[PDB]
Design a protein around this ligand. Structure first.
Ligand SMILES: CCCCCCCCCCCCCCCCCC(=O)OC[C@H](COP(=O)([O-])OCC[N+](C)(C)C)OC(=O)CCCCCCCCCCCCCCCCC
Ligand SMILES: CCCCCCCCCCCCCCCCCC(=O)OC[C@H](COP(=O)([O-])OCC[N+](C)(C)C)OC(=O)CCCCCCCCCCCCCCCCC
Ligand SMILES: CCCCCCCCCCCCCCCCCC(=O)OC[C@H](COP(=O)([O-])OCC[N+](C)(C)C)OC(=O)CCCCCCCCCCCCCCCCC
Ligand SMILES: CCCCCCCCCCCCCCCCCC(=O)OC[C@H](COP(=O)([O-])OCC[N+](C)(C)C)OC(=O)CCCCCCCCCCCCCCCCC
Ligand SMILES: CCCCCCCCCCCCCCCCCC(=O)OC[C@H](COP(=O)([O-])OCC[N+](C)(C)C)OC(=O)CCCCCCCCCCCCCCCCC
Ligand SMILES: CCCCCCCCCCCCCCCCCC(=O)OC[C@H](COP(=O)([O-])OCC[N+](C)(C)C)OC(=O)CCCCCCCCCCCCCCCCC
Ligand SMILES: CC(C)CCC[C@@H](C)[C@H]1CC[C@H]2[C@@H]3CC=C4C[C@@H](OC(=O)CCC(=O)O)CC[C@]4(C)[C@H]3CC[C@]12C
Ligand SMILES: CC(C)CCC[C@@H](C)[C@H]1CC[C@H]2[C@@H]3CC=C4C[C@@H](OC(=O)CCC(=O)O)CC[C@]4(C)[C@H]3CC[C@]12C
Ligand SMILES: CC(C)CCC[C@@H](C)[C@H]1CC[C@H]2[C@@H]3CC=C4C[C@@H](OC(=O)CCC(=O)O)CC[C@]4(C)[C@H]3CC[C@]12C
Ligand SMILES: N[C@H](C(=O)O)[C@H](OCc1cccc(NC(=O)c2ccc(C(F)(F)F)cc2)c1)C(=O)O
Ligand SMILES: N[C@H](C(=O)O)[C@H](OCc1cccc(NC(=O)c2ccc(C(F)(F)F)cc2)c1)C(=O)O
Ligand SMILES: N[C@H](C(=O)O)[C@H](OCc1cccc(NC(=O)c2ccc(C(F)(F)F)cc2)c1)C(=O)O
Lengths: 430, 430, 430
């Protein structure tokens, strides 16, 4: 049993092997030959091809996947027992993103030891672009300049700068998906077309992630060829500390507080019954294959009605990801702080909207998480190549992210139980 | 019976209420606080968001709606009794547009009391763009410059300026719609795809028109905050006079003359039999819901064969709109004259082609008339925000436009009767 | 029998009539009136409209036709007897393109009697664009510049210059076609959509080629209005000599050598049995209507198993075109040499990749060959209007190109016979 193991375990092993081979070839190149500025650009060329292929695919991905995500979510949601679960999912994902932003701008890993009305108005001017083909490559930006023919007079001009407009595409695909989902039968050809387009785009994302380790080997080798002071590793350690304390105070202080103020019962006697599901979600690292274990730990080990467990858990296994959203907020602001750049408050809200609204179009392919980390890095215009310093860390944080996703939608079945106590008697009587 | 009335009547009431609340808040703001140049730009911001949302939707609208319009018109047209009706519709729509252009450049409302070969050649260079994705945001423009190493030597250069190319998209969607309509069975998937895309785009146009009154309230308030001399209201009165005399000499002098030179019978004894249909089209303001009344006033109150009435009236209720085309020509040249701008003769023919060829893709949603008024304002590059001064007037001219649409296709059943007298005996004998 | 002949023969007759009427009107205009620089630009205006319409159509053509070509080729290929035919087709098409490039840069018709690493790296940077909508109009270009705060220090910058990116669209449509062809049943709506889009694009190419002779009449008239020295006709004669010697040493020296080193039998006793098929492919000038004649000349006049002839000949009649690929390579480098331009080695490999990979999406419409000659002229950014000087020659080289296409796929049935001798006994035993 040798080729079977490397058949089943090739993502984690190729990522770890690429990290260690890249670090050892960077050390063996640096302490044996000094490279100039030109040949440090030809050495990090497979990484350039990988960071081009990752940006090539995000446009049909965030069109087709967002359209089918919101159409299938509209199809699944039925009564007023399917509204409360969606509201719960999106409130806790927003709370997780806000906690991650507060923690990453308070701890500050990565820093070494004009009005704010125009940003908040360009945030709304970019949700409704003036052209829909041009939204696939250029954004808006307004600038307050001074007109002169005792007080100053001002005038606002606008210019279309380069870079994709993820907020306008997210908003238009949300509205278009709701419209073609509620059209019924006359817009079933559109749902079929965008569903097959989403499948064919997830397969190309899997092809790119088959190429990926040969790219991040050269990117890691080219990112320790300029190192001198042993100091970027402390920035990585502080980023791990920020993500782990964000998950540790999101799954202890916030979610049991939500359970206590809604249900008015003890959250820890609830969460002690989910121990098999949480240890399983740590061991197998996916929150959709630990679904039967959390089925038999909520209907049996607690006392939850199956009529709500048959809805909340299969929906929340795909669209309720608190830990991934907190991770993407913390990682985007950490990449911004690593490049000697201070974000505004239009950029923080763009990160905070693109991190929770990219949970809707979540199929079930765990590779595309990396593509989501490019999308929130490309909604605000940050250089994507520094995401290499996240991927080398990403195999040590996936376990706890899966644990917090499972804990969020396992608390959801307790939340939606108390709110919908009339409708369960209505489905019991008739 | 109170909430039922405001349920059935909410378009006219929200438009009128937005107009009067905008005028009273502009008067109450102007005579109580003086605003600078900067805070006159933040006051007209919901209007900016509305004029962005109106431009966001015109590209999938004029692609999908033109394709399904010309494909369904090709499907409906059968023999040589279905050719004459289409030729009649397009000749009278062109005559109405030409009469509107002549009247608006002769009366001139809105004015206060390089060769012309290169424009006419850019008009043909813009019907066949050199790229089809770039036609969704940029147009061509040629400039005759002078080369110098006794008579002058010249040379033509070309540059792609910004702004959508409505003429190239209209021509390509007309040819593409005819091709996939005549392909039969192998191109039925394309007709289904673009038909569902047209439905899903009309629903987003209805969503935008649900937002509209909150936008035109602030646009009207921001357009009487710069007023001083009581003079733009006289320009509005002259625009109403031009549209009403255009309809009054199109439905008295031109259409009865066409009837007299084709049929050689009295047009007024014909039109006196359509009195119930004309008063109905005034009372209910839509020319597709007054269709049974004009059915029973042409087959009964006159003497028209039903074999031509069953074709001409259901087709001409959607694609034969003379009054709307005259209105859009007069309103586009009035918006050009209001902004101290003299149009050329390439721009007048672009207005005159986009006004009659946007009657083909007419589904049956009466909101999208406003979107058509943006399209002819965006084929020639005029600022769209001044269309606010049309919308406040638009509830006083819709009745007479519906009356002239009904009168045009009611004269059509008399026209096509005399021309096709052999084919009716051929359908009677066999 | 007069109108029947001009019904069946209108492509060759309109091309020849346009050539002779254009030459006689250029001679009658030049020796009777001298034109300035400005009115030499209005005389060649229908040619400008034709060269705009030819560029308008290449984007949906190379998207939809490449997708359906590689999906249908994936569907047809079954066992290991369908792999060897595809490998044979693409190796001989590459050998033909390489022979054409060597012959055209060695003979040099058309000439009158920065690193090369950055070009070869932009060749790979253009196969994976950073945006997919922007790949429909702009390409990448890197430039090695010098940074200055004894040896020089350099730094590579990049800029997106204008012009369509045929290499990125070809690579993405190849990967997308393979993915939606191997998805099976869940991506059949995509195969149907792109198949109907390919049919509707071939019909618009036939409409443009109905317009074509009125365009090339004025282009030929405007290209002999600047002639003085009788010297461009010698360049045309040398281009004919280069294409004819390329076909003459591709169908005598290379293809019988491939047959001799694979089959180890005499190629001329094989090719003497194909005499009826070769004379037929000369007389009727299409290699897909001479298919039954080469069916009955390989299974009967030789001794080829029908189980391989029923696969190799219907596939190789559409995707195996050696003579057309050699012609397009020679013609693109000849158009480059005619405009006083020396190609690099990124541009020669772009021509050499776009010439063999545009044989995959080959439906069966013989007009679109001209559109392929624009595509390889637009992957490297050459002025397309000089393709007029190819079209006037193109009716004298089509016969021999059809002969070499038929000879290539007729040698293929002898090649694939010897390689697959085990599988034929496996299909005979069971
Ligand atoms: C905070 C707002 C949380 C609620 C958001 C969803 C609206 C509730 C609802 O009616 O859902 C059921 C409806 C349809 O249910 P229905 O058809 O039964 O009504 O479904 C949706 O609205 C689809 C999901 C839309 C999600 C939008 C997320 C935006 C995030 C921005 C940050
Ligand atoms: C280049 C050399 C890379 C070496 C990497 C070595 C480790 C990983 C190898 C995994 C291979 C394997 O067995 O996969 C099985 C997996 C299935 O494993 P699974 O069971 O996880 O699913 O196959 C796939 O995921 C499907 C992809 C098949 C193709 C794989 C090769 C792709 C090469 C990519 C080159 C660039 C393409 C650009 C595409 C976009 C262009 C527009
Ligand atoms: C003035 C020209 C008026 C005639 C235009 C339509 C052509 C007539 C015809 O054959 O119609 C039937 C044909 C098909 O009928 P058929 O298939 O029975 O032939 O239908 C069309 O041509 C579709 C409508 C095309 C309308 C183009 C409008 C252009 C306006 C520019 C200003
Ligand atoms: C303009 C005048 C051109 C005169 C050319 C005279 C010689 C060729 C005449 C051939 C006519 C014929 O019978 O064809 C039958 C052929 C069939 O012959 P077949 O048997 O070879 O197939 O019809 C077709 O191929 C279908 C096309 C029908 C339409 C033909 C006219 C097209 C006019 C084009 C103008 C520009 C259009 C731009 C389109 C793109 C816009 C986005
Ligand atoms: C904002 C507040 C606006 C207040 C306006 C008050 C008067 C009009 C209210 C009408 C409501 C109603 O009952 O409609 C029933 C009508 C049906 O009436 P009907 O019978 O005429 O059809 O519903 C619709 O037409 C469907 C639309 C439903 C959604 C309505 C709210 C839309 C909000 C738009 C915000 C911006 C969206 C941008 C979209 C594009 C983005 C890409
Ligand atoms: C030199 C390379 C020649 C071989 C190219 C095709 C690969 C062989 C193969 O597996 O084909 C069967 C496969 C599928 O067969 P399968 O599914 O039986 O495996 O088909 C293809 O690969 C489709 C054709 C792709 C052609 C790519 C051409 C690129 C040209 C660049 C210059
Ligand atoms: C840092 C901590 C203290 C933040 C606490 C946040 C809470 C105040 C939020 C988060 C989850 C929210 C709940 C999530 C879901 C719902 C269901 C929602 O929908 C319905 O019950 C009605 C649906 C219908 O019938 O239309 C009403 C609000 C409510 C109870 C929310 C009330 C406010 C809650 C408890
Ligand atoms: C300002 C006023 C005086 C303008 C007058 C315009 C008329 C001269 C036009 C407008 C309507 C036209 C008619 C509209 C429709 C048709 C049908 C059309 O098609 C057919 O009858 C033949 C169809 C076929 O069999 O192919 C022929 C032209 C005709 C009579 C047109 C002839 C010219 C008309 C009368
Ligand atoms: C200028 C001249 C001398 C160039 C000569 C070129 C040859 C060396 C090339 C061209 C055609 C090639 C052949 C084309 C097709 C095939 C089938 C190909 O596929 C298989 O037989 C295996 C398929 C499988 O089972 O997977 C193996 C290589 C081979 C024999 C190629 C071997 C190399 C050949 C003979
Ligand atoms: N393993 C965790 C756990 O199972 O919840 C967690 O899973 C992340 C995950 C799992 C499955 C699918 C996805 N997301 C997607 O496939 C995806 C695809 C497309 C988009 C889009 F928005 F369209 F760009 C966004 C997301 C993410 C993690 O790794 O952080
Ligand atoms: N009420 C009048 C009466 O019933 O004829 C008359 O109706 C205008 C009307 C009625 C119904 C539909 C439409 N037009 C559309 O929906 C439309 C939709 C799309 C386009 C496109 F060209 F594609 F942009 C053009 C028009 C216009 C008017 O209000 O002037
Ligand atoms: N007559 C020859 C003989 O029959 O092989 C030979 O035929 C060329 C021919 C014949 C049939 C179809 C095609 N090509 C196409 O239709 C085509 C269509 C699209 C593309 C694309 F790549 F998508 F742009 C490429 C090619 C070419 C020739 O004329 O040189």
């Amino acid at each position: 049993e040798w080729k079977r193991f490397l058949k089943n375990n090739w993502v984690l092993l190729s990522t770890v092997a690429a990290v260690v081979l890249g670090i050892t070839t960077g050390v063996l190149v640096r302490e044996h030959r000094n490279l100039s500025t030109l040949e440090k650009f030809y050495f990090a060329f497979p990484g350039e091809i990988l960071m081009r292929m990752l940006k090539l695919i995000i446009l049909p991905l965030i069109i087709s996947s967002m359209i089918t995500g919101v159409a299938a979510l509209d199809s699944n949601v039925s009564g007023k027992i399917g509204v409360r679960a969606v509201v719960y999912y999106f409130c806790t994902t927003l709370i997780a993103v806000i906690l991650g932003i507060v923690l990453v701008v308070s701890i500050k890993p990565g820093v070494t030891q004009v009005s704010t009305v125009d940003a908040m108005l360009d945030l709304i001017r970019n949700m409704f672009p003036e052209n829909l083909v041009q939204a696939c490559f250029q954004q808006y930006k307004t600038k307050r300049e001074e007109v002169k023919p005792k007080t100053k007079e001002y005038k606002i001009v606008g210019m279309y700068s380069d870079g994709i407009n993820v907020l306008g595409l997210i908003v238009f695909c949300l509205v278009f998906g709701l419209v073609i989902g509620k059209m019924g039968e006359k817009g079933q050809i559109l749902v079929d077309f965008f569903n097959a387009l989403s499948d064919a785009t997830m397969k190309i994302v899997q092809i790119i992630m088959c190429y990926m380790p040969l790219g991040i080997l050269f990117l890691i080798a080219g990112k320790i060829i300029e190192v001198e002071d042993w100091e970027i590793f402390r920035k990585l350690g502080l980023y791990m500390a920020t993500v782990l304390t964000g998950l540790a105070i999101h799954s202890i202080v916030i979610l049991p507080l939500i359970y206590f103020i809604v249900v008015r019962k003890n959250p820890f006697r609830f969460a002690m019954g989910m121990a098999q599901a949480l240890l399983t979600a740590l061991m197998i690292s996916s929150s959709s294959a630990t679904l039967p274990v959390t089925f038999r730990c909520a209907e049996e080990n607690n006392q939850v009605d199956k009529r709500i467990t048959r809805f909340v858990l299969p929906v929340g296994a795909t669209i309720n990801m608190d830990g991934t959203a907190l991770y993407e907020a913390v990682a985007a602001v950490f990449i911004a702080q690593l490049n000697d750049l201070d974000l505004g408050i239009g950029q923080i809200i763009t990160i905070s909207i693109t991190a929770t609204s990219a949970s809707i179009g979540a199929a079930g392919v765990p590779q595309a998480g990396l593509v989501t980390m490019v999308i929130v890095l490309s909604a605000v215009g940050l250089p994507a190549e520094d995401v290499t310093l996240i991927i080398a860390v990403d195999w040590l944080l996936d376990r706890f992210r899966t644990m917090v996703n499972v804990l969020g939608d396992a608390f959801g079945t307790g939340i939606v139980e108390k709110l919908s106590k009339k409708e369960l008697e209505q489905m019991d009587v008739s």
